[PDB]
Amino acid sequence: MKLHTDPATALNTVTAYGDGYIEVNQVRFSHAIAFAPEGPVASWPVQRPADITASLLQQAAGLAEVVRDPLAFLDEPEAGAGARPANAPEVLLVGTGRRQHLLGPEQVRPLLAMGVGVEAMDTQAAARTYNILMAEGRRVVVALLPDGDSLEHHHHHH
């Protein structure tokens, strides 16, 4: 009667919390990161909940509509219209880590226009909700932010 836990590698989950970092896939990121079950891992140069801009929200969404280095170069045989991914974060979980920074329409509208529902919470609250939405199997991306420490605190100089 021992329940076998069958691990699906599509479930990108935090393997260890830690102080000054967050361990995902046993990769201990000592800085802000945005990752999803289906999606990329965005590295944030954010150290505090004050660094968060609309630009960074676009990065955290893992969109990248314009590719800096096109892997599949289209010579453009058409000039009508393009089809967007639609695999974008249906819900975006922004975790400020230290304290909830209320992001307003000014910053979140660029994503709201795409249908991206942005939640403003902290790392802990975002993690729980992320697990729910990831278990549900919905397009969710979570951005977690260090709650006090970072790579900088490992040094005593710059």
Side-chain angles (χ1 to χ4, degrees), residues 45-130:
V46 173
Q47 303 290 268
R48 55 200 163 220
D51 302 310
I52 304 177
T53 51
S55 314
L56 296 179
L57 294 178
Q58 294 174 329
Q59 303 191 332
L63 301 178
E65 180 167 87
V66 54
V67 188
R68 314 186 198 244
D69 297 289
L71 302 180
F73 181 77
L74 299 179
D75 69 292
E76 301 176 290
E78 188 197 295
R84 289 189 143 134
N87 288 326
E90 225 181 291
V91 52
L92 183 65
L93 302 179
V94 181
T96 35
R98 306 185 186 228
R99 172 172 166 98
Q100 303 183 331
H101 179 178
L102 302 181
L103 309 179
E106 174 187 76
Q107 301 173 329
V108 298
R109 192 274 172 134
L111 297 179
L112 296 180
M114 298 178 179
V116 182
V118 183
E119 291 294 301
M121 295 179 298
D122 288 296
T123 302
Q124 186 180 91
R128 289 191 176 235
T129 312
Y130 170 65

Coordinates of all heavy atoms in Angstrom, one line a residue, residues 45-130:
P45 N 18.1 40.6 -13.4 CA 19.1 41.3 -12.7 C 18.5 42.2 -11.6 O 19.1 43.2 -11.2 CB 19.7 42.2 -13.8 CG 18.6 42.4 -14.8 CD 17.7 41.2 -14.7
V46 N 17.4 41.7 -11.1 CA 16.7 42.4 -10.1 C 17.1 42.0 -8.7 O 17.4 40.8 -8.5 CB 15.1 42.1 -10.2 CG1 14.4 42.7 -9.0 CG2 14.6 42.7 -11.5
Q47 N 17.3 42.9 -7.8 CA 17.8 42.7 -6.5 C 16.7 43.1 -5.4 O 16.7 42.6 -4.3 CB 19.1 43.4 -6.2 CG 20.2 43.1 -7.2 CD 20.8 41.7 -7.0 OE1 21.7 41.5 -6.3 NE2 20.1 40.8 -7.7
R48 N 15.9 44.0 -5.8 CA 14.9 44.6 -5.0 C 13.5 44.7 -5.7 O 13.5 44.9 -7.0 CB 15.3 45.9 -4.4 CG 15.7 46.9 -5.5 CD 16.6 48.0 -5.1 NE 17.3 48.6 -6.2 CZ 18.5 49.0 -6.2 NH1 19.3 48.9 -5.1 NH2 19.1 49.6 -7.2
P49 N 12.4 44.7 -5.0 CA 11.1 44.9 -5.7 C 10.9 46.2 -6.3 O 9.8 46.5 -6.9 CB 10.1 44.7 -4.5 CG 10.9 45.0 -3.3 CD 12.3 44.6 -3.6
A50 N 11.9 47.1 -6.3 CA 11.8 48.4 -6.8 C 12.4 48.4 -8.2 O 12.2 49.4 -9.0 CB 12.6 49.4 -5.9
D51 N 13.1 47.4 -8.6 CA 13.7 47.3 -9.9 C 12.7 47.0 -11.0 O 12.9 47.2 -12.2 CB 14.9 46.3 -10.0 CG 16.0 46.5 -9.0 OD1 16.5 47.6 -8.9 OD2 16.3 45.5 -8.3
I52 N 11.6 46.4 -10.6 CA 10.6 45.9 -11.5 C 10.0 47.0 -12.4 O 9.4 47.9 -11.9 CB 9.5 45.2 -10.7 CG1 10.1 44.1 -9.8 CG2 8.4 44.6 -11.7 CD1 9.0 43.3 -9.0
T53 N 10.2 46.8 -13.7 CA 9.6 47.7 -14.6 C 8.7 46.9 -15.6 O 8.7 45.7 -15.6 CB 10.6 48.5 -15.4 OG1 11.6 47.5 -16.0 CG2 11.4 49.5 -14.6
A54 N 8.0 47.6 -16.5 CA 7.2 47.0 -17.5 C 8.1 46.2 -18.5 O 7.7 45.2 -19.0 CB 6.3 48.0 -18.3
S55 N 9.3 46.7 -18.7 CA 10.3 46.0 -19.6 C 10.6 44.7 -19.0 O 10.6 43.7 -19.7 CB 11.5 46.9 -19.7 OG 11.2 48.3 -19.9
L56 N 10.9 44.6 -17.7 CA 11.2 43.4 -17.0 C 10.1 42.4 -17.0 O 10.3 41.2 -17.0 CB 11.8 43.7 -15.6 CG 13.0 44.5 -15.6 CD1 13.5 44.8 -14.1 CD2 14.2 43.8 -16.3
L57 N 8.9 42.9 -16.9 CA 7.7 42.1 -16.9 C 7.6 41.4 -18.3 O 7.2 40.2 -18.3 CB 6.4 43.0 -16.7 CG 6.3 43.6 -15.3 CD1 5.0 44.5 -15.3 CD2 6.3 42.5 -14.3
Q58 N 8.0 42.0 -19.4 CA 8.0 41.4 -20.7 C 9.0 40.3 -20.7 O 8.8 39.3 -21.4 CB 8.3 42.5 -21.7 CG 7.2 43.5 -21.9 CD 7.6 44.7 -22.9 OE1 8.8 45.0 -23.0 NE2 6.6 45.2 -23.6
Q59 N 10.1 40.5 -20.1 CA 11.2 39.5 -20.0 C 10.7 38.3 -19.2 O 10.9 37.2 -19.5 CB 12.5 40.1 -19.4 CG 13.0 41.3 -20.2 CD 14.4 41.6 -19.7 OE1 14.8 41.4 -18.6 NE2 15.2 42.2 -20.6
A60 N 10.1 38.6 -18.0 CA 9.6 37.6 -17.1 C 8.5 36.7 -17.7 O 8.3 35.6 -17.3 CB 9.1 38.3 -15.8
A61 N 7.8 37.3 -18.7 CA 6.7 36.6 -19.4 C 7.3 35.6 -20.4 O 6.6 34.7 -20.9 CB 5.8 37.6 -20.1
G62 N 8.6 35.7 -20.6 CA 9.3 34.7 -21.5 C 8.8 34.8 -22.9 O 8.9 33.8 -23.6
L63 N 8.3 36.0 -23.3 CA 7.8 36.2 -24.6 C 8.8 36.1 -25.7 O 9.0 35.1 -26.4 CB 7.0 37.5 -24.7 CG 5.9 37.7 -23.7 CD1 5.2 39.0 -23.8 CD2 4.8 36.6 -23.9
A64 N 9.6 37.2 -25.8 CA 10.6 37.4 -26.8 C 10.0 37.1 -28.2 O 10.3 36.1 -28.9 CB 11.8 36.4 -26.6
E65 N 9.2 38.1 -28.7 CA 8.6 38.0 -30.0 C 9.6 38.3 -31.1 O 9.6 37.6 -32.1 CB 7.4 38.9 -30.1 CG 6.6 38.9 -31.4 CD 5.3 39.6 -31.4 OE1 5.3 40.8 -31.6 OE2 4.3 38.9 -31.1
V66 N 10.4 39.3 -30.8 CA 11.5 39.6 -31.7 C 12.7 38.9 -31.2 O 13.2 39.1 -30.1 CB 11.7 41.1 -31.8 CG1 11.9 41.8 -30.5 CG2 12.9 41.4 -32.7
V67 N 13.2 37.9 -32.0 CA 14.4 37.2 -31.7 C 15.6 37.9 -32.2 O 15.8 38.2 -33.3 CB 14.3 35.7 -32.3 CG1 15.4 34.9 -31.8 CG2 13.0 35.1 -32.0
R68 N 16.6 38.1 -31.2 CA 17.8 38.8 -31.6 C 18.6 38.0 -32.5 O 19.2 38.6 -33.5 CB 18.6 39.1 -30.3 CG 17.8 39.6 -29.1 CD 18.6 40.0 -27.9 NE 17.8 40.1 -26.7 CZ 17.7 41.2 -26.0 NH1 18.2 42.4 -26.5 NH2 17.0 41.2 -24.9
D69 N 18.7 36.7 -32.3 CA 19.4 35.8 -33.3 C 18.4 34.8 -33.8 O 18.2 33.7 -33.1 CB 20.6 35.1 -32.6 CG 21.6 36.1 -32.1 OD1 22.3 36.7 -33.0 OD2 21.8 36.3 -30.9
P70 N 17.8 35.0 -34.9 CA 16.8 34.1 -35.5 C 17.4 32.7 -35.8 O 18.4 32.6 -36.6 CB 16.4 34.8 -36.8 CG 17.5 35.8 -37.1 CD 18.0 36.2 -35.8
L71 N 16.8 31.7 -35.2 CA 17.2 30.3 -35.5 C 16.7 29.8 -36.8 O 17.3 29.2 -37.6 CB 16.8 29.4 -34.3 CG 17.4 29.9 -32.9 CD1 16.9 28.9 -31.8 CD2 18.9 30.0 -32.9
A72 N 15.4 30.1 -37.0 CA 14.7 29.8 -38.2 C 14.4 31.1 -38.9 O 13.4 31.8 -38.6 CB 13.5 29.0 -38.0
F73 N 15.2 31.5 -39.9 CA 15.0 32.8 -40.6 C 14.0 32.7 -41.6 O 14.1 31.9 -42.6 CB 16.4 33.2 -41.2 CG 16.3 34.6 -41.9 CD1 16.2 35.8 -41.2 CD2 16.2 34.6 -43.3 CE1 16.1 37.0 -41.8 CE2 16.1 35.8 -43.9 CZ 16.0 37.0 -43.2
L74 N 12.9 33.5 -41.5 CA 11.9 33.5 -42.5 C 12.2 34.6 -43.5 O 12.5 35.8 -43.1 CB 10.5 33.8 -41.8 CG 10.0 32.7 -40.8 CD1 8.7 33.1 -40.2 CD2 10.0 31.4 -41.5
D75 N 12.2 34.3 -44.8 CA 12.5 35.2 -45.8 C 11.3 36.1 -46.1 O 11.3 37.0 -47.0 CB 12.9 34.5 -47.1 CG 11.8 33.7 -47.7 OD1 11.3 32.7 -47.1 OD2 11.4 34.1 -48.9
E76 N 10.2 35.8 -45.4 CA 8.9 36.6 -45.5 C 8.3 36.4 -46.9 O 8.5 37.3 -47.8 CB 9.2 38.1 -45.2 CG 9.7 38.4 -43.9 CD 10.0 39.8 -43.6 OE1 11.0 40.3 -44.3 OE2 9.3 40.5 -42.9
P77 N 7.6 35.3 -47.2 CA 6.9 35.1 -48.4 C 5.5 35.7 -48.4 O 4.7 35.5 -49.3 CB 6.8 33.6 -48.5 CG 6.8 33.1 -47.0 CD 7.4 34.2 -46.2
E78 N 5.2 36.4 -47.3 CA 3.9 36.9 -47.1 C 4.0 38.3 -46.4 O 5.0 38.6 -45.8 CB 3.0 36.0 -46.2 CG 1.6 36.4 -46.1 CD 0.9 35.7 -44.9 OE1 0.8 34.5 -44.9 OE2 0.5 36.5 -43.9
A79 N 3.0 39.2 -46.6 CA 3.0 40.5 -45.9 C 1.6 40.7 -45.3 O 1.3 41.9 -45.0 CB 3.4 41.5 -46.9
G80 N 0.8 39.7 -45.1 CA -0.5 39.8 -44.6 C -0.6 39.9 -43.1 O -0.8 41.0 -42.6
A81 N -0.4 38.8 -42.4 CA -0.4 38.9 -41.0 C 0.4 37.8 -40.4 O 0.8 36.8 -41.1 CB -1.9 38.7 -40.5
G82 N 0.7 37.9 -39.1 CA 1.4 36.9 -38.4 C 0.6 36.2 -37.3 O -0.3 36.9 -36.7
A83 N 1.0 35.0 -36.9 CA 0.3 34.3 -35.8 C 1.1 34.3 -34.6 O 2.3 33.9 -34.6 CB 0.0 32.9 -36.3
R84 N 0.6 34.9 -33.5 CA 1.3 35.0 -32.3 C 1.2 33.7 -31.5 O 0.3 32.9 -31.7 CB 0.8 36.2 -31.4 CG 1.2 37.5 -32.0 CD 0.8 38.7 -31.1 NE 1.9 39.7 -31.2 CZ 1.6 41.0 -31.3 NH1 0.4 41.5 -31.4 NH2 2.6 41.8 -31.4
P85 N 2.2 33.4 -30.6 CA 2.4 32.2 -29.9 C 1.1 31.6 -29.3 O 0.8 30.4 -29.4 CB 3.4 32.5 -28.8 CG 4.2 33.6 -29.4 CD 3.3 34.4 -30.2
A86 N 0.4 32.5 -28.5 CA -0.8 32.1 -27.8 C -0.4 31.1 -26.6 O -1.3 30.6 -25.9 CB -1.8 31.4 -28.7
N87 N 0.9 30.8 -26.5 CA 1.4 30.0 -25.5 C 2.0 30.9 -24.4 O 2.7 30.4 -23.5 CB 2.5 29.1 -26.0 CG 1.9 27.9 -26.9 OD1 0.8 27.4 -26.6 ND2 2.7 27.6 -27.9
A88 N 1.7 32.2 -24.4 CA 2.2 33.1 -23.5 C 1.5 32.9 -22.1 O 0.4 32.3 -22.1 CB 1.9 34.5 -24.0
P89 N 2.1 33.4 -21.0 CA 1.5 33.3 -19.7 C 0.1 33.8 -19.6 O -0.2 34.9 -19.8 CB 2.4 34.2 -18.8 CG 3.2 34.9 -19.8 CD 3.4 34.1 -21.0
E90 N -0.9 32.8 -19.4 CA -2.3 33.2 -19.3 C -2.4 33.9 -17.9 O -3.3 34.8 -17.8 CB -3.1 31.9 -19.3 CG -4.4 32.0 -20.2 CD -5.2 30.8 -20.2 OE1 -4.8 29.8 -20.8 OE2 -6.3 30.8 -19.6
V91 N -1.6 33.5 -17.0 CA -1.5 34.1 -15.7 C 0.0 34.3 -15.3 O 0.8 33.3 -15.5 CB -2.2 33.3 -14.6 CG1 -1.8 31.9 -14.6 CG2 -2.0 33.9 -13.2
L92 N 0.4 35.5 -14.9 CA 1.7 35.7 -14.6 C 1.8 36.0 -13.1 O 1.2 36.9 -12.6 CB 2.3 37.0 -15.4 CG 3.7 37.3 -15.1 CD1 4.7 36.2 -15.6 CD2 4.1 38.6 -15.8
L93 N 2.6 35.2 -12.4 CA 2.8 35.4 -10.9 C 4.1 36.1 -10.6 O 5.2 35.6 -10.7 CB 2.8 34.0 -10.3 CG 1.5 33.2 -10.5 CD1 1.6 31.8 -9.8 CD2 0.3 33.9 -10.0
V94 N 4.0 37.4 -10.3 CA 5.1 38.2 -9.9 C 5.3 38.2 -8.4 O 4.4 38.6 -7.7 CB 5.0 39.6 -10.4 CG1 6.2 40.5 -10.0 CG2 4.7 39.7 -11.9
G95 N 6.4 37.6 -7.9 CA 6.7 37.6 -6.5 C 7.8 38.6 -6.2 O 8.9 38.5 -6.6
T96 N 7.4 39.6 -5.4 CA 8.3 40.6 -5.0 C 9.3 40.2 -3.9 O 10.4 40.8 -3.7 CB 7.6 41.9 -4.5 OG1 6.4 41.5 -3.8 CG2 7.2 42.8 -5.7
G97 N 9.0 39.1 -3.2 CA 9.9 38.5 -2.3 C 9.9 39.2 -0.9 O 9.6 38.6 0.1
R98 N 10.3 40.5 -1.0 CA 10.4 41.2 0.3 C 9.1 41.8 0.8 O 8.7 41.5 1.9 CB 11.4 42.4 0.0 CG 12.7 42.0 -0.5 CD 13.7 43.2 -0.6 NE 15.0 42.8 -1.3 CZ 16.2 43.1 -0.8 NH1 16.3 43.7 0.3 NH2 17.3 42.8 -1.5
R99 N 8.4 42.5 -0.1 CA 7.0 42.9 0.2 C 6.3 43.3 -1.1 O 6.9 43.7 -2.1 CB 7.1 44.2 1.1 CG 5.7 44.8 1.3 CD 5.7 45.9 2.4 NE 4.5 46.7 2.3 CZ 3.4 46.5 3.1 NH1 3.4 45.5 3.9 NH2 2.3 47.3 2.9
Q100 N 5.0 43.0 -1.1 CA 4.1 43.2 -2.3 C 4.2 44.6 -2.8 O 3.9 45.6 -2.1 CB 2.7 42.9 -1.9 CG 2.4 41.5 -1.4 CD 1.0 41.2 -1.1 OE1 0.2 42.1 -0.8 NE2 0.6 40.0 -1.2
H101 N 4.8 44.7 -4.0 CA 4.8 46.0 -4.7 C 3.6 46.0 -5.7 O 3.5 45.3 -6.6 CB 6.1 46.2 -5.5 CG 6.2 47.4 -6.3 ND1 7.4 47.8 -7.0 CD2 5.4 48.4 -6.5 CE1 7.2 48.9 -7.6 NE2 6.0 49.4 -7.3
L102 N 2.6 46.9 -5.4 CA 1.4 47.0 -6.2 C 1.7 47.6 -7.5 O 1.8 48.8 -7.7 CB 0.4 47.8 -5.4 CG 0.0 47.3 -4.1 CD1 -1.1 48.2 -3.4 CD2 -0.5 45.9 -4.1
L103 N 1.9 46.7 -8.5 CA 2.1 47.1 -9.9 C 0.7 47.6 -10.5 O -0.3 47.0 -10.3 CB 2.6 46.0 -10.7 CG 3.8 45.3 -10.1 CD1 4.3 44.1 -11.1 CD2 5.0 46.2 -9.9
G104 N 0.8 48.7 -11.2 CA -0.5 49.3 -11.7 C -0.6 49.2 -13.2 O 0.3 48.7 -13.8
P105 N -1.8 49.6 -13.7 CA -2.0 49.5 -15.1 C -0.9 50.1 -16.0 O -0.6 49.6 -17.1 CB -3.3 50.4 -15.3 CG -4.0 50.3 -14.0 CD -2.9 50.2 -13.0
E106 N -0.3 51.1 -15.5 CA 0.9 51.8 -16.2 C 1.9 50.7 -16.6 O 2.4 50.7 -17.7 CB 1.5 52.8 -15.2 CG 2.8 53.4 -15.8 CD 3.5 54.2 -14.8 OE1 4.2 53.7 -13.9 OE2 3.5 55.5 -14.9
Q107 N 2.2 49.8 -15.7 CA 3.2 48.8 -16.0 C 2.7 47.5 -16.5 O 3.3 46.9 -17.4 CB 4.0 48.5 -14.7 CG 4.6 49.8 -14.1 CD 5.2 49.5 -12.7 OE1 4.8 48.7 -11.9 NE2 6.3 50.3 -12.4
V108 N 1.5 47.1 -16.1 CA 1.0 45.7 -16.4 C 0.1 45.7 -17.7 O -0.2 44.7 -18.2 CB 0.2 45.1 -15.2 CG1 1.1 44.9 -14.0 CG2 -1.0 45.9 -14.9
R109 N -0.3 46.9 -18.1 CA -1.3 47.0 -19.3 C -0.7 46.3 -20.5 O -1.4 45.6 -21.2 CB -1.7 48.5 -19.5 CG -2.8 48.6 -20.5 CD -2.3 48.6 -22.0 NE -3.5 48.6 -22.9 CZ -3.6 49.4 -24.0 NH1 -2.6 50.3 -24.2 NH2 -4.6 49.2 -24.8
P110 N 0.6 46.6 -20.8 CA 1.3 45.9 -22.0 C 1.1 44.4 -22.0 O 1.0 43.8 -23.1 CB 2.8 46.2 -21.8 CG 2.8 47.5 -21.1 CD 1.5 47.6 -20.2
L111 N 0.9 43.8 -20.8 CA 0.7 42.4 -20.8 C -0.8 42.1 -20.7 O -1.3 41.1 -21.3 CB 1.4 41.8 -19.5 CG 2.9 41.9 -19.6 CD1 3.5 41.3 -18.3 CD2 3.5 41.2 -20.8
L112 N -1.6 43.0 -20.0 CA -3.0 42.8 -19.9 C -3.6 42.8 -21.3 O -4.6 42.1 -21.5 CB -3.6 43.9 -19.1 CG -3.2 44.0 -17.6 CD1 -3.8 45.1 -16.9 CD2 -3.5 42.7 -16.9
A113 N -3.1 43.6 -22.2 CA -3.6 43.7 -23.6 C -3.5 42.4 -24.3 O -4.2 42.1 -25.2 CB -2.8 44.8 -24.3
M114 N -2.5 41.6 -23.8 CA -2.3 40.3 -24.4 C -3.1 39.2 -23.8 O -3.3 38.1 -24.3 CB -0.8 39.9 -24.3 CG 0.2 40.8 -25.0 SD 1.9 40.4 -24.8 CE 2.7 41.6 -25.7
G115 N -3.7 39.6 -22.7 CA -4.6 38.6 -21.9 C -3.8 38.0 -20.8 O -4.3 37.0 -20.2
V116 N -2.7 38.6 -20.4 CA -1.9 38.0 -19.4 C -2.3 38.6 -18.0 O -2.1 39.8 -17.7 CB -0.4 38.4 -19.6 CG1 0.5 37.8 -18.5 CG2 0.1 37.9 -20.9
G117 N -2.9 37.8 -17.2 CA -3.4 38.2 -15.9 C -2.2 38.2 -14.9 O -1.7 37.1 -14.5
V118 N -1.8 39.4 -14.5 CA -0.7 39.5 -13.6 C -1.1 39.6 -12.1 O -1.9 40.4 -11.7 CB 0.1 40.8 -13.9 CG1 1.4 40.9 -13.1 CG2 0.5 40.8 -15.4
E119 N -0.5 38.7 -11.3 CA -0.7 38.7 -9.9 C 0.5 39.3 -9.2 O 1.6 38.9 -9.4 CB -1.0 37.3 -9.4 CG -2.3 36.7 -9.8 CD -3.5 37.4 -9.2 OE1 -3.6 37.5 -8.0 OE2 -4.4 37.9 -10.0
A120 N 0.2 40.3 -8.3 CA 1.3 40.9 -7.5 C 1.3 40.3 -6.1 O 0.5 40.6 -5.2 CB 1.1 42.4 -7.4
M121 N 2.3 39.4 -5.9 CA 2.4 38.7 -4.6 C 3.9 38.6 -4.2 O 4.8 39.2 -4.9 CB 1.8 37.3 -4.6 CG 0.3 37.4 -4.8 SD -0.4 35.7 -4.9 CE 0.4 35.0 -6.4
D122 N 4.2 37.9 -3.2 CA 5.6 37.6 -2.8 C 6.0 36.2 -3.2 O 5.1 35.4 -3.6 CB 5.8 37.9 -1.3 CG 5.8 39.3 -1.0 OD1 6.7 40.1 -1.5 OD2 4.9 39.8 -0.2
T123 N 7.3 35.9 -3.0 CA 7.8 34.6 -3.5 C 7.0 33.4 -2.9 O 6.7 32.5 -3.6 CB 9.3 34.5 -3.1 OG1 10.0 35.6 -3.7 CG2 9.9 33.2 -3.5
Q124 N 6.8 33.4 -1.6 CA 6.1 32.3 -0.9 C 4.7 32.1 -1.4 O 4.3 31.0 -1.8 CB 6.1 32.6 0.6 CG 5.5 31.4 1.4 CD 5.5 31.7 2.9 OE1 4.5 32.2 3.4 NE2 6.6 31.4 3.6
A125 N 3.9 33.2 -1.5 CA 2.6 33.2 -2.0 C 2.5 32.8 -3.4 O 1.6 32.1 -3.9 CB 1.9 34.5 -1.7
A126 N 3.4 33.3 -4.2 CA 3.5 33.0 -5.6 C 3.8 31.5 -5.8 O 3.2 30.9 -6.7 CB 4.5 33.9 -6.3
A127 N 4.7 31.0 -5.0 CA 5.1 29.6 -5.1 C 3.9 28.6 -5.0 O 3.7 27.7 -5.8 CB 6.2 29.2 -4.1
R128 N 3.1 28.8 -3.9 CA 1.9 28.0 -3.6 C 1.0 28.1 -4.8 O 0.5 27.0 -5.3 CB 1.2 28.4 -2.4 CG 2.0 28.1 -1.1 CD 1.2 28.3 0.2 NE 1.9 27.9 1.4 CZ 1.4 27.0 2.2 NH1 0.2 26.4 2.0 NH2 2.1 26.7 3.3
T129 N 0.7 29.3 -5.2 CA -0.3 29.5 -6.3 C 0.2 28.9 -7.6 O -0.5 28.4 -8.4 CB -0.6 31.0 -6.5 OG1 -0.9 31.6 -5.2 CG2 -1.8 31.2 -7.4
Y130 N 1.6 29.1 -7.8 CA 2.2 28.5 -9.0 C 2.0 27.0 -9.1 O 1.7 26.5 -10.1 CB 3.7 28.9 -9.0 CG 4.5 28.2 -10.0 CD1 4.3 28.4 -11.4 CD2 5.5 27.3 -9.6 CE1 5.1 27.8 -12.3 CE2 6.3 26.6 -10.6 CZ 6.1 26.9 -11.9 OH 6.9 26.2 -12.9

